Amino acid sequence: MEMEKEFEQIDKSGSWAAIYQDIRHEASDFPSRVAKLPKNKNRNRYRDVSPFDHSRIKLHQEDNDYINASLIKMEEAQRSYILTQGPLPNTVGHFWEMVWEQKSRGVVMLNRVMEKGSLKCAQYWPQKEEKEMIFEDTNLKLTLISEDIKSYYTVRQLELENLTTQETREILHFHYTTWPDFGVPESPASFLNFLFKVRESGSLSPEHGPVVVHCSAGIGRSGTFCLADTCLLLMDKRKDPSSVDIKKVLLEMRKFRMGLIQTADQLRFSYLAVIEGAKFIM
Ligand SMILES: CC(=O)N[C@@H](Cc1ccc(O)cc1)C(=O)NN
């Protein structure tokens, strides 16, 4: 039942929350024993937001490998992503250790450091060229190379140095800036173009390790980014573009990360992001 038609009847009835709770009721439930251990109390920004043990990204170290990061592996779509929370003052060195280990090209951010007068994440990248950051706990160094500031996003070039191998790599900061404080973006137009812009970079390609995407919790705004890309990828690919079930995509993803897609407005907006993007792939 096509995604244009469904909506329509979803509007016609207005039962977004009603659609939305059923997915919440049909979603995966798996253990999260690692997250919950006591020595990890400080690596979680939220007590109710936890990575499942079976899909948890692990940090390459034998003492403590824990981070609130999971691997969403999409079989069909031949696409992979890591969802993580906004880093904390105690996790910064862990976020970049992850970027390294995993061999990612890109870092995507759907949020500002300050929203509603309070802190959404740590300031974790260098704002000035001659002002480099060193992550002592994890022996890496990061340098701001260049900055492309535009209306809805900014793209930054960074240099990540594994101070232990002295090897260096180039990472791309894709930062979306205009998402509103309350609600959802008033028009999917800008979220989509930024999604094409991230693909444009080569960051969501198999030729690198999965992309790292985050917002504050690592489930909401992050979930729309991946639900939509994957659905778009799926439409190009199948005979029947019409075949794409957005609820079905979401529950598959939900098997790898708890609560992807936080409110009924995001579900629909996720729906308009798919619906509207199809209109170029073609
Ligand atoms: C008709 C309706 O329920 N609209 C939503 C708001 C909405 C707008 C754009 C989005 O992309 C997503 C959600 C609403 O009124 N919710 N209360």
Structural summary, described in words:
The chain has one domain: Protein-Tyrosine Phosphatase, Chain A, CATH 3.90.190.10. The chain has helices at residues 5-13, 16-26, 33-36, 92-102, 188-200, 221-237, 246-254, 264-278; strands at residues 69-74, 79-84, 106-109, 114-115, 118-119, 133-135, 140-149, 153-162, 167-176, 211-214. The chain starts with a helix and ends with a helix. With 282 residues, it is an alpha/beta fold. The strands form two sheets. An eight-stranded mixed sheet has the order 1-2-10-3-9-8-7-6, with helices on both faces. It has a two-stranded antiparallel ribbon with strand order 4-5. The chain has eight helices and ten strands. Helix 2 (16-26) packs across helix 8 (264-278), helix 5 crosses helix 8 (264-278) and helix 6 (221-237) runs parallel beside helix 8. The radius of gyration is 19 Å and the shape is globular. It is 32% helix and 20% strand. The PDB classes it as hydrolase. Keywords: PanDDA, SGC - Diamond I04-1 fragment screening, protein tyrosine phosphatase, PTP, protein tyrosine phosphatase 1B, enzyme, allostery, multiconformer, hydrolase. The assembly is monomeric.
